[PDB]
Design a protein around this ligand. Structure first.
Ligand SMILES: COc1ccc(C(=O)N2CCCc3cc(C4=NNC(=O)S[C@@H]4C)ccc32)cc1OC
Ligand SMILES: [Ca+2]
Ligand SMILES: [Ca+2]
Length: 71
C-alpha cells in the first residue's frame, strides 16, 4: 500500500540538498548514515538501474519507479 503518499516523502527523505534530485555524492552519505562499509557495487549498481536518464542522479519519474514504496 503506502501509495505515492510515502513515495513523496522518501524522495525528500533521500534528498539532502533540497534540489529535487538525488546524486551518488548523496547516496554514499545515505549508506554511511544507515551503515557505511558498503561495497562500491551497491552505490553504482543501485544508481545505474536507477539512472534511466543516465545523468548521475534520480528524478521524480525514475525515483517514483525505483522507489515503489521503499523503507
Ligand atoms: C537499514 O539498512 C539500510 C538502509 C538503507 C539502505 C539504502 O541504501 N537504501 C534503502 C532503501 C531506499 C534506497 C533507495 C536507493 C535509490 N536507488 N535508485 C533510484 O533510482 S532512487 C534511490 C536514490 C538507494 C539505496 C536505498 C541500505 C541499507 O542496508 C543495505
Ligand atoms: Ca539530493
Ligand atoms: Ca535519472
Amino acid at each position: 500500500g503506502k501509495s505515492e503518499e510515502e513515495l513523496s516523502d522518501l524522495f525528500r527523505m533521500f534528498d539532502k540538498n533540497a534540489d529535487g534530485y538525488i546524486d551518488l555524492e548523496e547516496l554514499k552519505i545515505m549508506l554511511q548514515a544507515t551503515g557505511e562499509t558498503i561495497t562500491e557495487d551497491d552505490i553504482e549498481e543501485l544508481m545505474k538501474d536507477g539512472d534511466k536518464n543516465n545523468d548521475g542522479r534520480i528524478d521524480y519519474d525514475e525515483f517514483l519507479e525505483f522507489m515503489k514504496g521503499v523503507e
